[PDB]
Ligand binder design. Structure first.
Ligand SMILES: [Mn+2]
Ligand SMILES: [Mn+2]
Ligand SMILES: [Mn+2]
Ligand SMILES: [Mn+2]
Lengths: 196, 196, 196, 196
């Protein structure tokens, strides 16, 4: 059984960068739905698997990836943000960024370009490539999780689904990206990085 | 050269079903961007084609489909709505619907299910299948146009991208679908149907 | 657990339309591989599912659909062929065909066109639309199974992967299609149809 | 206008690694088809573009990518092979390889794994990442060209469509991969690399 994780702060904690209304809808409505739908889908899949019903297993793939991915992506997202975030990262994460992207500002531009360039709904990802041993930026459509579809280990995710910024920034996705840098929890990104 | 078409009514004409703010953003910002980006992309494609640069032609495919599709989809959408719409269609369109879906209410359920079931951004379409000679419902991802990708002739389109309802209905997509039936321009759908 | 099904005839029973070498490789090598990889994939999915590992489940989807689909498609294919097949169908099936495609000739023309037009590897399908209650033609890429991805019930499948004809007909897919009509088991197709 | 390129050697020059029959069919039949269909598709796209027909342009995308990609991929492939090829690369290329993949052996191991793992028809590519300045391995489905869809610059391509080996190696793709290393034109690969 999967559960909706509690937010590490108060819905209004990210203001004025991300207003309380968005945080509340995004977490208590959108994320909750994914978790609920995921549990329903997993139960159906278990039955199909027990019966060896391959057709049913393949028919359920879209619902599982969408809801399972929705749950995974958001759980990481909440930990990537903090009312005490912002600024730049330090330690070896910082040097990894300089080494792989040239500079922190260059990295920001790269991830911002990837995020803003998503057609429709999606996510912009900084991830870690275990095979090559370096940082890598990637964009994923809809709710397709980073690791499950690309193999990259997620470090920092940026949700560019409209439900993440439209109420406040409307059609100006770049304004949203500009504001989010102020609440990035770099200690969390560093932990995730040191883990892999 | 492609142009942003004028709306056949006043931004506030669809209230209280679709508020003026959404209509204004959707038309003057979102649709305008698609048209502008389409013209820029078409010009690049013409140059690539003149030079026989196949790589450049393939690299531009996503931008052309997204913006070209955005322009096509919305141009039809505006004509599908009307402050004097609502109710049910009459004439042979109505009997085609009864014949292919059983009843008008059944048709509404079918198209509503298709529209609400879109994962991420997309469109719900009632179209005409010229090969088989009957009505057909289809859902398209993001801005993928109906005819260009499926061959079906579009009759009525329902935009389920968040920029079409979120400001007003938030995460409750079903409430939006419920309201839109009140402003469907059936005379336009009938014209499109009689044309094919 | 899934098993490679035994054939209702010997490998050379369909000559000269489809030679023995192709039948032997297709069944003992290609289908066998799918069955083996499918068993391994379900095994892993069972472990991932028991541990609630959503990432692992999503990572396994491509393999499950490809090998699971391979097993489903070929299992049906073998029954669709017969050393004493060929000719035309009779009864309700022949009636449904004339009604949905005009005539047996047009149906054949349509299925052939759908099969030859597949870009790369895939399958051409005559299917049954349970929702609309009519016959329908569809093409699927690689091993994507008909019912699992489109909802249509499979009645007759034409494998257009190179391993189904290349040794005998080389690049001339049209010659392959022309020949296969001589070994279609209409009795089995009729059976599948009546079950709808 | 696009033309079928003449080969720098005769069809049987690569034996016994790749037999003459395969080379003849692959070049005079498969590549020829792509070139012919590509010319027809560009012709139609030019008409659609002049009339501002966005629907037609989008409908033509699948054909342009498939045949255009087919032409691009095979044109490069022929230059990647040589009757006096084989062995290992030298100079900067060999340096870059060891640096990005540990050693020539690991690189070979990686490219082989990527090529054999392709589900259905496709290509395994050694490419150059102009943005990151390092070598990269990638696999592409059907005829999707490397640069047009991933941005990577192609250096070496391995065609894993059945029409490239089936007549000789049947279902044993690994045997095909093992053999092709004996006819790789490292001189041409080095040339493409130095051009970056
Ligand atoms: Mn979200
Ligand atoms: Mn819209
Ligand atoms: Mn097969
Ligand atoms: Mn080839």
């Amino acid at each position: 059984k999967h559960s909706l994780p509690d937010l590490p702060y108060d819905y209004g904690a990210l203001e004025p960068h991300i207003n309380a209304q968005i945080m509340q809808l995004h977490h208590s409505k959108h994320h909750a739905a994914y978790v609920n739908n995921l549990n329903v889908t997993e139960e159906k899949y278990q039955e199909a698997l027990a019966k060896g019903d391959v057709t049913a297993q393949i028919a359920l793939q879209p619902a599982l990836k969408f809801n399972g991915g929705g749950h995974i992506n958001h759980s990481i997202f909440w930990t990537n943000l903090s009312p005490n975030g912002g600024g730049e990262p330090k330690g070896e994460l910082l040097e990894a960024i300089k080494r792989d992207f040239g500079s922190f500002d260059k990295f920001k531009e790269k991830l911002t370009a990837a995020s803003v360039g998503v057609q429709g709904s999606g996510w912009g990802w900084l991830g870690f490539n275990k095979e090559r041993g370096h940082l890598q930026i990637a964009a994923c459509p809809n709710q397709d999780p980073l690791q499950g579809t690309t193999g990259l280990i997620p470090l920092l995710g940026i949700d560019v689904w409209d439900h993440a910024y439209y109420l406040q920034y409307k059609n100006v996705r770049p304004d949203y990206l500009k504001a989010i840098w102020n609440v990035i929890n770099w200690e969390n990104v560093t932990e995730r990085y040191m883990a892999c």
